[PDB]
Amino acid sequence: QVTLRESGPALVKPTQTLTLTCTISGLSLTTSGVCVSWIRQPPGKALEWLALIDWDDDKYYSTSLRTRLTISKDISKNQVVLTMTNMDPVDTATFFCARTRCTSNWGYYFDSWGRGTRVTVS
Amino acid sequence: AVVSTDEYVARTNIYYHAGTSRLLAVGHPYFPIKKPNNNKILVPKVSGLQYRVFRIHLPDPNKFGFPDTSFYNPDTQRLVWACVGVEVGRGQPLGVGISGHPLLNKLDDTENASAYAANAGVDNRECISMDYKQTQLCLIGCKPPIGEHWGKGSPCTNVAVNPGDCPPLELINTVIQDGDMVDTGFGAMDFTTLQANKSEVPLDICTSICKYPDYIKMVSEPYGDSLFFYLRREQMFVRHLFNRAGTVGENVPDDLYIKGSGSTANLASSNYFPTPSGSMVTSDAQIFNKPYWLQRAQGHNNGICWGNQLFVTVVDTTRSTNMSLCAAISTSETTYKNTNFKEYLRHGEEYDLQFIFQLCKITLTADVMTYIHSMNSTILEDWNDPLKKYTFWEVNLKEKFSADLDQFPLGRKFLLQA
Amino acid sequence: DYIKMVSEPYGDSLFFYLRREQMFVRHLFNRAGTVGENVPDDLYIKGSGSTANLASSNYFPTPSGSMVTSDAQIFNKPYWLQRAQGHNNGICWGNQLFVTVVDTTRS
Amino acid sequence: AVVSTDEYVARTNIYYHAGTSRLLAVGHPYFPIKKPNNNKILVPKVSGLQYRVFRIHLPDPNKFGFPDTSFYNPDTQRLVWACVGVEVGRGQPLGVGISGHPLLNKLDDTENASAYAANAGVDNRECISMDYKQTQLCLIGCKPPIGEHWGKGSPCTNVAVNPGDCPPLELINTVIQDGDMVDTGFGAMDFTTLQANKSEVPLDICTSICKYPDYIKMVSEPYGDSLFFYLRREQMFVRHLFNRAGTVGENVPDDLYIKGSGSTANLASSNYFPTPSGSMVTSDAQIFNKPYWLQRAQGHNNGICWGNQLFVTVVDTTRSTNMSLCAAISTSETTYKNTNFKEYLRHGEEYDLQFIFQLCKITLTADVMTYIHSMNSTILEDWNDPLKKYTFWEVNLKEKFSADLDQFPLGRKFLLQA
Amino acid sequence: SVLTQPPSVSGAPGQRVTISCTGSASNIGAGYDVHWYQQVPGAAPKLLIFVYSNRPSGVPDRISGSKSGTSASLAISGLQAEDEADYYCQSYDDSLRGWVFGGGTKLTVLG
């Protein structure tokens, strides 16, 4: 099985820096072909992909939030770290780290999803 | 270092002819008929696009009843049969067959489109046929032929690769077994384990490996046992240009097109594939019904048939005519009705292989023994079966041998040449 | 039956011959009728709706007598049988000769 | 004045064979697969319509471990490898591929119109395919090959030329890099910077330069280093006749037609273009699998491989068969569905280059040194890399050399010839 | 969102309801796959469709989809109480250079 569990500050204040952190188990980040993304969902709103990181250290971000986003992974912890800068109050949303399988076609997909963690900016 | 077999093998004026009486194989051209639930085949698949590899068996000269063995000394030397001449006779008239798939994956004829293609609505497969690539190749050797094909290897990624991802391409050698399928213009590949649609390719080769003789490997072989003479006269073209259906495995880069609108907004599938054609078949282009003399085999093995074996690979799509064969269910009806007649397809293949052999003697010096042992120890073990793995047309000539060349047509032709 | 005639012991049937036949698939067609040999189920994935009906796979070709030209003419030429393959070197036993002629280039 | 290299280079009876074991390249036939946003290619574009230029590297004879160097005096002369024979082996079966554009610019089939063409309503692009021009050309040299192509020059007017005006035609020389595209019947031109539509030409060459070997320039070169032997067997025809869509860049002169009325009042676009066709591919027309002897190179450079380098350009569209590769997203469904299978195209290319070299010696007189310096000073600098600019199939034969020709097939063929 | 969906659809138990996600030439027209996610509100999303009309593991066999023009479909035949969830189509877009989701159709099972 592939399991993901998110962690981070459930409460943050504006103009601060937010650092989510999603733990992967049953899978190794060193394996070629492995990718993980972050997808946030504001209260009662559609999902919005944020970033993608893969075994090859290649990184992707939403163009509108590219200037605010940086993603990485730590092999020692089998960990994925996401950092969003200059939090706005409207960023309040649930953040899901979902194992992206990186199929050949650029219509990638999120095979498995984490529990999701609420982040509130106020 | 390998040495020309001639360097140590001596030739003799003792010639012999031996060839099958009349080989004949008849069966379904597309697939092997069987029973409703068994693996008991009822009628074999006999198509003209098959490598009819004959594993000829020759009598052992050391245990052969020669009229007088004074020509060689058994106390210090042995004997082997050298293949001097071969004639692959063919009796059936020339004619190119046909094959097709009731549900060949073919979205539309992209050869010339009057209007943009419509939506690809669930299973647009079509009943399409085609006439396969023309091929005529004969291989003569003592080791079994080695072909080639594209199989499945280890994928680029090792992430328990995603369902339906790239099936990696691997080049795989393999012995060409009798009944295997020749490349038919769709490429040499193992459709069985490399194309799931089960619709990319016509029925008769849909679940079979399209092998091609690895001429480079066979020629570069150190001892050149696989073949010491060959020919190839294959040709074809794109009869039609078609398109595959399905989700796009590799989407066209966006720098590789300007986005469309409306009807053209949908990028049609770019997975184009050709429909081959067995173009002109003629007597002038006939490999067969001719005697080929192997006096100057490239190979270091100058025709010496080690182990009293000969492997004759024959491909002939210039006689692959599939003829119908309808049988009436009942003649009680005065008027034609479509369902009153059952449809049958049976392809007739006729072969008549002929040969000339020159007897040879091997002197067992220490160096000669060591060289032959290193080459193939199994040869020494015969004087002083690993091929059970492969299926071949087992053809026995041990009793067909005769010393009178003048009586047989190949013997007369060899006499006139020699 | 060129093989049989050539392998005949006395070679009386023929001692000289020629052949210049050729053609191709002008068109590709399909036979109608009930399927004598149904396609194995491992030899296709079942269809639905319109394609649910497996069309007849009894394909057959339509031949074509391609280019006929003077250069490809067997006839109007003298053939000398001085070197008949056959053991019968042209001897017409019984004062008989059998001359088979096929000519679709004037049909 | 240039002098036949023979005039001062001496030949020796010391021959050597060296050839790759088995070159193999596999990749997408149309475009280089990459990652969704990177310039990290994931699967290279391997098509049969590419100049597979091999930059062979030879061992330096002056620093080579010959069995005994008594044949030459190092104190006054050096050594170089002369290319005496080449065999471009090919293993893959013959078969012509296919390419197409989902939105090829094609208004209508003007080949035979039943009624006058209708209105050209915004983006009438079509999903059309074609089978490309057939080409077989092999070039052997020591300098890199030089092709040609039509690029963009300085326009006729210098008014900050109007948007969409004439793109001036310029003839531009350039070194043929490995992976570049051969002329495919659409003309040798740089579509990338010369066709803004991005739809005039099929996908696989839409954003690539169609180069053609500048035989005139290479032959007229003073030293003839670029090539000293070559062959060409290209042919094709107009499979179909089509028309381009878009506003008329050059309106038909009014003296060049009588005005129409009603439906014909609209002059249809006269920007006709042909659809090529790789006509019959056959064994008889095979350049490859044959040994070419360069004993009588036209060039003043009679095969001398200055710098221990060889450039072997190979074009082979007679084996360009593109083979699909469907993979199954899931076998849980009992019934065929179009979207259940992903479509993949992968073209397999196999090369096996073989060679024979005759060792040569150069005596360093004052005149000989001056001549060699003027020819190429870099040669002298080696005894007593500017090609990093171009990408070539880096093939190393420094350890593949062997003095036993009889062991290898090309060596045996050369023995039989020599 | 570049992709479009009906904000809400309803269907009584035993009926078949289709949720259509319409894109443009940049995302769905190019051929990028469409993926549907079933999400019970207040919980993590779940993978429901993996390719056009393709079923992941553990997904009921009655759910399917289709590919038609620049749009995709999510057909839920034999509706049940378990289908009381939102659904999002997902693909890749060429103008955005990133992955996108739909409008989140809110399916409801009628009494």
Residue numbers in the entry:
A (entry chain H): 1 to 35, 35A, 35B, 36 to 82, 82A, 82B, 82C, 83 to 100, ...
B (entry chain C), D (entry chain B): 34 to 417, 452, 454 to 486
C (entry chain D): 247 to 353
E (entry chain L): 2 to 9, 11 to 27, 27A, 27B, 27C, 28 to 95, 95A, 95B, ...
Paper text:
The HPV virion is composed of an approximately eight kb circular double stranded DNA genome, encapsidated by major (L1) and minor (L2) capsid proteins that assemble into a T = 7 icosahedral particle composed of 72 pentameric capsomers. Twelve capsomers have five neighbors (pentavalent) and 60 capsomers have six neighbors (hexavalent). The C-terminus of each L1 connects capsomers by an extension, referred to as an arm, that bridges the intercapsomer canyon, forming disulfide bonds with the neighboring capsomer and returning to the parent capsomer. Although the C-terminal arm has been shown to be immunogenic, most antibodies target sequences encoded by five surface exposed loops (BC, DE, EF, FG and HI) and because the amino acid sequences that form these loops vary by type, antibody responses tend to be type-specific or weakly cross-reactive.
Cryogenic electron microscopy (Cryo-EM) revealed that two of these antibodies bound five Fabs per capsomer interacting with all five L1-surface loops. Using this complex, we obtained a cryo-EM reconstruction to 3.0 Å. The structure revealed five Fabs bound to the L1 capsomer at the interface between two L1 proteins (protomers). Each Fab interacts with all five variable loops, the DE- and EF-loops of protomer 1 (P1) and the BC-, FG-, and HI-loops of protomer 2 (P2). The Fab binds the two protomers with a total buried surface area (BSA) of ~1,745 Å2, with ~840 Å2 from the heavy chain and ~905 Å2 from the light chain. All six CDRs are involved in binding as well as the framework 3 (FR3) of the light chain. On each L1 protomer, the total BSA is ~ 1,838 Å2, with ~434 Å2, ~ 81 Å2, ~ 346 Å2, ~ 592 Å2, and ~385 Å2 from the BC-, DE-, EF-, FG-, and HI-loops, respectively. An alignment of the two structures, including the L1 capsomer and each Fab, has a root mean square deviation (RMSD) of 0.8 Å over 2050 Cα atoms.
